[PDB]
Amino acid sequence: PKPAVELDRHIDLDQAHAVASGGARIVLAPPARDRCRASEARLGAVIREARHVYGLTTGFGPLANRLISGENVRTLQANLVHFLASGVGPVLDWTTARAMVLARLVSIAQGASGASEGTIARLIDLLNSELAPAVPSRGTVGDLTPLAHMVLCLQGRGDFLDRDGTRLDGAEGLRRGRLQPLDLSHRDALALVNGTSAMTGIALVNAHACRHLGNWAVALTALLAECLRGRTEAWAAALSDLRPHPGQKDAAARLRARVDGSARVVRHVIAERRLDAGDIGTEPEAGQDAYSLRCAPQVLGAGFDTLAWHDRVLTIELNAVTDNPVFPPDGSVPALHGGNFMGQHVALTSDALATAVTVLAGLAERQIARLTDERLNRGLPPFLHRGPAGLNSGFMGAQVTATALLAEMRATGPASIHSISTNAANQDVVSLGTIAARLCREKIDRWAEILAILALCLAQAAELRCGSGLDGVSPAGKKLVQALREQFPPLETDRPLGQEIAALATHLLQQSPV
Amino acid sequence: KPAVELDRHIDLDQAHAVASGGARIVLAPPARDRCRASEARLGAVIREARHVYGLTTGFGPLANRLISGENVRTLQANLVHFLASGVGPVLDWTTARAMVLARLVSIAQGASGASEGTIARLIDLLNSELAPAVPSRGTVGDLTPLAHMVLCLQGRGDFLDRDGTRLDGAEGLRRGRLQPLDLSHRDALALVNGTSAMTGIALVNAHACRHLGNWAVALTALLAECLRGRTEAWAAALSDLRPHPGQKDAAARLRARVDGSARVVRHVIAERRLDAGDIGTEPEAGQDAYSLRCAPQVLGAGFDTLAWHDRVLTIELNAVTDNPVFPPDGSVPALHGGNFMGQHVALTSDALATAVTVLAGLAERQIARLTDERLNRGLPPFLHRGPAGLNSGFMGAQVTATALLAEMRATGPASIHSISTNAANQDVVSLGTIAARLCREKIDRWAEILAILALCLAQAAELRCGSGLDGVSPAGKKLVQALREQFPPLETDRPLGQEIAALATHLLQQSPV
Amino acid sequence: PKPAVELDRHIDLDQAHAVASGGARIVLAPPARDRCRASEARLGAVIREARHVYGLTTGFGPLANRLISGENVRTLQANLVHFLASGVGPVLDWTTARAMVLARLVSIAQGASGASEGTIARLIDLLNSELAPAVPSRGTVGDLTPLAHMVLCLQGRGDFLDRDGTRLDGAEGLRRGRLQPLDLSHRDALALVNGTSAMTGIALVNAHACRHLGNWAVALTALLAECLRGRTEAWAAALSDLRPHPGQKDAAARLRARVDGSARVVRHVIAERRLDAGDIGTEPEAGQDAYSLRCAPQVLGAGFDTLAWHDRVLTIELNAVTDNPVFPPDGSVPALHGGNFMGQHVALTSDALATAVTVLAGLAERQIARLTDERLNRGLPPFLHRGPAGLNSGFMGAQVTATALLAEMRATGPASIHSISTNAANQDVVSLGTIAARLCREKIDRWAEILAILALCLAQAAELRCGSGLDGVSPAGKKLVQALREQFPPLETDRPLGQEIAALATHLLQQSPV
């Protein structure tokens, strides 16, 4: 009884990802079907009336001053798909390519693109099938190129990808997924090759992954506190109220919940202690933890607020019409020409999220560095090894790997600042939003690997500190370690961890600890 | 002079008004009462000898060294001393005062324990025409700059007059009619705490960005009047189809700027029905290049980034970023945490810096298009006057704008460079102050790029429409006439460096109205 | 009759790539064999005499303060390979992985590593086979991790790669390659897990690719001049002599040779012309070309000088011993402990080269932008299309793709500046050389794609300007276009170019236009 998302006007990010990931099927609501039929009729009229419209009676880009006779429009649009198919590089992953198709569909569903029923049906069919078009990730300045490749795929002139990433030729794809070859006879090619569908698709996948990684970041910080006698007073709600950033209040509340029931953290407020002359001297530990624990609400919180902004902007973009030209539903004018395809919004939010992800990955990396340092981990074995010290190095290698992954993340900055005048100066400013979204994705993948290493370290640390029975560990903490131990054995002796790290990271990106 | 009464909340405009000296500041009775209550709570915490950071402990990782009451004044005096290791150019007058204001707003919430005298010193500084002279570098995000502020307020550091001229501490206290700061109440941590510096810098960035954004819109509009731009791309209907608040706002403001103009193209091209005889190559395309057609989308994305930045900053400015803190409700004697972690300002400052660089890029490309004889539709190359060749007009200024932009691009986000420090106690740091400062530098470059565009447009408007500016919108005419009051037309090549600099200074503080 | 490289002490970059790419077999010269046999004996003596030596009588990293008894050394070194195998990410390509193996071998050949005959034989056998170890590209801060994975592969406990990148399991690899399983019973594991072999291997492949791409950059700049009536006086030897940078002098000489025999370039020195009163006015074109042509010697030259520096440093690194500890061949002391494994040299040169590659890619991108712009290409069709204008857009899509590739290159900066204290603060400074070399490689790949687009554009532009017969085109220019036309047909009508761009890019990275 696979869930179904009925698309009318608005779709939220979770619904969008459910469809893109194949978790839910999609259906076009009757009201939307009618709006599209109405827009299809407007396109037909615009064409019959020989209105001066980009892509219907003109060339493309700077060549738009070259008018085209009606008799040659099917050729014009066929060549459009052709000359735009210059993409190169690895193909977008299965879920992301599907998210791109969904983004184009949501835009069309608003009823201002003139797409024909058949065209809309082909997109819905793809989304309801187990396939995804195989489209190169590079080539656009922000998303005609990847969309042109999508068109070729839907016509059976390009490869398809199954859930595993294995490619099928065009014919096989249409066959296996029961897809009908795309037919652009209605001259509605610009309804498919238009907008910010690719960057939006990539960004929606980034948004979903960050939600899960954010949950792990919280869960692991909480478990870290249980392994290092962390002080919970730094996570007090009263502190959040004094500096009311939503993301911070949320992070602190979630951290408190994770360690609820723990007998391993320090819950005493230090100021409750009254000192006398005999207390004046040097104590073993300071009354507050290092920042990787004490400032977690503030660091994680800032990241959560960046994601919140990113998602607010993305929700608007996903449900908008980023086409050019557009055909006003009210019929005020035959069509409007502008630049709603300029993806500066997703470009700027992706760059911002990328920075936030790098910052949070840095936190996890430092948490690993502290947990594995015998001089800072308050009594735990160096690098959390088991067996004789020296002969065994435990997580010593994995710890450096986390640092290496972080260092690589830092080498890449915002994509948005690199606009270069192109297309014979017609596109004198470009968003590079697709690139921005892809760079953010890479950082998200690195962050998952760093968190994976931290998770494996914590599972081991929890047992070293509290015994295999995890005595004193919170219910949430126990469940997380027990779940990890179902697939990842304790490190009783040194062994290669690379494959386990990669395996766990893939899981972190798709599911939260609950 | 207007007065801003500070109770609990203050908006960014009120904050800048006080920081810039445009308005006096007064602490509302309710705020004074809350602060007196907090002062009393600190007194009790001290009398009770509660274990509290900075009152009974050393600092940083040295907090494990407990301190006896008789030594606390020395302890807090040393705190200010060892933290005063800042270097680099001092913060400008307005920004330094904004930092003072930020600390005051935090204290006014009533959880810092600041004494009436300490609060009075901050208010006095803000009501005077002076600013403390504080080095800009040294903090990983803001004890160092605040420590320097304290030294200045005690007359042990320099002050800055509105012009930036420095005065020694003693002279500063006398000229500003300020009394030396006295921390005998052991309330030093009420002054050396939080995110005051980055917040002060960021609020000045916010104000400057609002003005530059107004200029970016006004100059884009005037560009359209000089290049026969098509207004249909700025139609509200398009905004409604892609409802980003910033984009809708940008488009509306653009339309308003060109209202009444006879120099722009208002025809919707799809209205035209083509005949077989029209098929061929026409003189111009039916749509403009992106620097005009996509202005709503580019400026809009920038405006939405600034809106996010401002929402976050408003919360930070009105929050208590202190540590430790003394709960007004008396639930516990004090709370220890990390509200001083400036990650929020760090991330928003970096995000804004990117948006600023993007928008400066748009302005830079608009100059490049306007001054190009192959692209400016009939205007002289580089908008020169007099004999061509003999005169190059704005040819130099155009390259200078490109140079300014290229420089902006060389600097990226500051937040990603966290480095474990303070003997690993501060294993993660925000670098928020650095982030806000880097954003300020890009903002200054953007102002210079816009200044160049404005001078180019004033010349272009006259070359296209004559000195009378025939067909130019009322807003466009008013803008050019205003500029012409201080900046003469370029009838023959002349040095523009000083004019560009002077105009940029203006753009940062005032909008085209 | 497959060539053979006899390794004694020194090997140049060309010989190294010849072996790494499988173009030549490798053999150890008699003196090298003897130096290695002697070093092997020295390691035996060190063990026999129970000398305090890292990895032989101590734990690893900060754990080196834990001394180890002789009977546990086999286990110690076995665990070393284990805990270090935490690598993740896509495996290094066939040639690069083998280049890494070669790098370790050359270091060992200096006779200060103590590697046994068998160990050396395993490396040689690998290089003389058609296989490469499958090693993850990420994990090192600069190269124990990737080398540990190498060891596992050589023992038949890790995958292998054939020339096509198809993976084989350990067993299949040893079988298909007719290889013997690596046996570290002599306790010479540190002879394999040591040094800067990975970054050096990666960098030597970057060096080879940049030489070819550099040749294409020159050839295409020259052809561009023949398509736009470029002035050769800007490339005069006299100018080079006035600003004697080696790279510039060479670039200018190579550019002149490429257009030798051309009737399509302007060779007249403008200053020879004497002007009269009737000449004063506005001429159609300026007396000098735009920078993308006029400043080619200077821009290409600076890039070539950067590559020259990179190669000088790399040559030293490749032929050096970057191991720790080391066993002095002169027998002065049993062993020396230091940090010759710190890859700061490769890190800084890789970062410098990466910057130069981005700059040169920028030149190529602007050359494409100028050539396709009807307002700047002096009479050529917009975007070099054929067929009716507007209906056909030619390379309009490819041109934007080139811009997108360049913008993405610019988003990534130097890797070296991101050092982070790790390994419980033992490694308080790290080089990140491997990452730097990898980032440089990605940029080289992007540069090749951009050059490929420019090459396709120039082939079309040359025929459009000079006819299919290429009348007036230099002999070198004709040969290049004709060579390209053998595999890439003219663009008579718009068609997808993505796959062709990628195919040509692969070719440009391995062969120069000759």
Ligand SMILES: O=C(O)/C=C/c1ccccc1
């Ligand atoms: O001016 C436009 O709206 C179209 C630009 C463009 C650029 C490259 C390929 C196709 C269209």
Ligand SMILES: O=C(O)/C=C/c1ccccc1
């Ligand atoms: O841990 C804290 O709250 C204090 C840190 C610190 C570090 C350097 C100087 C002053 C305070």
Ligand SMILES: O=C(O)/C=C/c1ccccc1
């Ligand atoms: O001090 C050294 O030379 C060794 C460091 C090290 C760090 C991580 C893994 C293995 C060795």
